[PDB]
Amino acid sequence: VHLTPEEKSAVTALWGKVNVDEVGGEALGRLLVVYPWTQRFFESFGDLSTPDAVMGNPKVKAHGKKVLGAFSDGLAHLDNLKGTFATLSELHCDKLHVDPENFRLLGNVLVCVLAHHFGKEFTPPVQAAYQKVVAGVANALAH
Amino acid sequence: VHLTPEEKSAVTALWGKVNVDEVGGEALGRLLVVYPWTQRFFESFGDLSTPDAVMGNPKVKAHGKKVLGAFSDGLAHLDNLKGTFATLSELHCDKLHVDPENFRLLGNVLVCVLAHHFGKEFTPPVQAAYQKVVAGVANALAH
Amino acid sequence: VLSPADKTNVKAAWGKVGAHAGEYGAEALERMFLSFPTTKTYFPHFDLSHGSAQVKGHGKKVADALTNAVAHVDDMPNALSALSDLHAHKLRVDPVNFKLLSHCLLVTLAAHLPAEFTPAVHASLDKFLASVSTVLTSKY
Amino acid sequence: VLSPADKTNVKAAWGKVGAHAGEYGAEALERMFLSFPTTKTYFPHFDLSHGSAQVKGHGKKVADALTNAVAHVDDMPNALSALSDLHAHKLRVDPVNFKLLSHCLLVTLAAHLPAEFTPAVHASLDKFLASVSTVLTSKY
Ligand code: HEM
Ligand code: HEM
Ligand code: HEM
Ligand code: HEM
């Protein structure tokens, strides 16, 4: 991922105000709700029938925290995304059998979550920077 | 692209029996017919209204010949697809603005054309080997 | 295929959108142009700068089309026949671009209606926009 | 959305498919398993070898479902409600696998009916299989 200095500054400034526990679980739960075929991987979490049950699942919240930790680690290494996500790519491609389109879907859900949380300050330039960031992250996981 | 020696031997033997002039043109015309939005890139080829007009287009036939020549070049360099399809990837991305999904669509159409031409000779193992080949080619163009 | 639940959710969400539809559509178009520059090739005659009157008018048109699609959710395929003719036969737009515009519309709605954008409403709007895109990309 | 011309094309093509539907469906399933091994994860209780009786029976079931869908093309969501409930609510199948199975069915039809597999019939069958995949994936 190649970013302009202004885009990098905006991305870092917006990520500074992100609450790691709340945004990650919210994005994972929105993924599981909007794309119900993704609960096939998370059946082990438990009750995932209603949206309120999906969004009120402690396992979903913890796994969202882990996912956002991985996203932050990727953000800290924007010039080494392929090498940063090698182990996770192996895990998702060999042991979990996750389709690469689901990575793009989760990235888009995370962008929607960021827009929901920040409102007006999620300007179209910031959204473009985050869009190419999540595109790079998804391309690294697919590799 | 990683293929077994038997898969490589089968792929090459079917490829020798391939009539390039007919196969490339048929694959391109079938792509343009089944996925009509692809005619935006080929509006310079003349009349592409009906399927019969698409399949009877000398420009379409010649471009299909060129596409199948590129496919053969990639087949001969299965271990260096990314380096072989660098110029074509640049042409298709920077200048033509072709979405990477259309490469997979054209690969699937080519596989269907090969099955149509060979019948029983297109066994499921041969199809699997050719699917790996065309998926590798599509990814190199997408790069 | 839509269910009565998500149909009602989409109707309520667009009713809450109300009169801000034109500005929401213009902002969605601006977001799509900024974050997916390949979509700019479909508007070579446009002035695609920030605050452009042409983009504002086209966003208003897109929003009005979405409003009438909501009003005719059960009979969208023939309620949007003119738009299907325009986009599928004449413009020949890739459905990927429809996916991108749907995502940008969802982002705009999330940014402008925080309370209304529950996960259920998000899923309902996602499905509704997928069906509108399918009608406008299908060639019948 | 399907046009009457493509509906007639699909009807004629599957009518001439006729009694070989079970063999064609079994071969399509075998092709999907061989070329896309990730699809094998949905059948952990099955014997996925060549000439398997379980695969042959499942191919016969899939072919019968496709024949019913062809006979009820105009009311697909109401004709494939049980299969939609099975695939969307209970199995939760990724639509990518539906795309792969549709492509393998197209390859099998091309390999077994070279004469009927004209470009127009190919496009009609592609649209028909896409519509079938849409209904089974959707939950309503
Ligand atoms: C797109 C960006 C993604 C990121 C950054 C990400 C991150 C992670 C991380 C860090 C783990 C390790 C959890 C652990 O070790 O306990 C994990 C596991 C996992 N991921 Fe992802 N993931 C992504 C996409 C997805 C998607 C889209 C799905 C499913 C649709 C998925 C399914 C799973 C599953 C099932 C696990 C194992 C959970 C468990 O064992 O409890 N991942 N992911
Ligand atoms: C595996 C997939 C593909 C391969 C191997 C391939 C190969 C080629 C080749 C060999 C050329 C000729 C370049 C030259 O003569 O300098 C070309 C050009 C071109 N390609 Fe592709 N191509 C693929 C996919 C596609 C697809 C799917 C589309 C459109 C949907 C497309 C659109 C074009 C166009 C418009 C040109 C220029 C033709 C002209 O200017 O008359 N390509 N490609
Ligand atoms: C997704 C929902 C969409 C809706 C509801 C929609 C609706 C409309 C409407 C109402 C018009 C104006 C019709 C007229 O002036 O007679 C239009 C025109 C147009 N649309 Fe869309 N559209 C959508 C998606 C797209 C996308 C994704 C693209 C391209 C990436 C696109 C490209 C165009 C173009 C190029 C025009 C012509 C503009 C002009 O002639 O000034 N549309 N659309
Ligand atoms: C046009 C596409 C498809 C059609 C017409 C179709 C049709 C059917 C039919 C008729 C059954 C029998 C249900 C029963 O006997 O209870 C079935 C079951 C099943 N389908 Fe599909 N299917 C399609 C696509 C897929 C795909 C792509 C997958 C997975 C990659 C899949 C996975 C399954 C599974 C796991 C079962 C359970 C069978 C068993 O447990 O014995 N289906 N489907």
Author numbering:
A (entry chain B), B (entry chain D): 1 to 143
C (entry chain A), D (entry chain C): 1 to 140
From the paper:
As monitored by UV-Vis spectroscopy, metHb has a Soret maximum at 405 nm, indicating that the heme iron is in an oxidized state (Fe3+) and incapable of binding O2. To eliminate these possibilities, we next assessed the effect of the protective oil layer on grid preparation and downstream cryoEM imaging and data processing using our metHb sample. Briefly, we created two metHb samples – one without and one with the protective oil layer – by placing 15 µL of metHb (~ 125 µM) each into two sample cups. One sample was used without modification (non-oiled), and ~ 70 µL of aerobic Al’s oil was carefully layered over the second sample up to the brim of the sample cup (oiled). We did not observe any noticeable differences neither in the quality of the sample stripes on the grids nor in their behavior during data collection. A comparison of our 2.78-Å resolution non-oiled and 2.71-Å resolution oiled metHb EM densities did not indicate any notable differences in their overall quality. Indeed, the view distribution and the total number of particles were similar between the samples, each resolved to a similar resolution and demonstrated similar map-to-model validation metrics. D, E Comparison of metHb densities determined with or without the protective Al’s oil layer detailing no obvious differences in the metHb densities between the sample with oil present or not. Thus, the addition of Al’s oil to protect the sample during chameleon grid preparation does not significantly hinder the operation of the chameleon nor our ability to obtain high-resolution structures.
Here, we present a workflow that utilizes the SPT Labtech chameleon – a next-generation nanospray cryoEM grid preparation device – in an aerobic environment to freeze O2-sensitive proteins under functionally anaerobic conditions, which we term (an)aerobic. Demonstrating the utility of this workflow, we determined high-resolution cryoEM structures of deoxygenated human hemoglobin (Hb) in various liganded states and the molybdenum-iron protein (MoFeP) – the O2-sensitive catalytic component of Azotobacter vinelandii nitrogenase – in a reduced state. Our workflow maintains (an)aerobic samples by protecting against or eliminating O2 contamination prior to loading into the chameleon, during sample aspiration, and throughout sample deposition on self-wicking EM grids, respectively. Finally, we detail the effects of O2 contamination at different stages of the workflow and show how to prevent their effects. Together, we demonstrate reproducible high-resolution structure determination of O2-sensitive proteins of varying complexity and size – as small as 64 kDa – with a workflow requiring only minimal modifications to a robust, widely available EM grid freezing method.
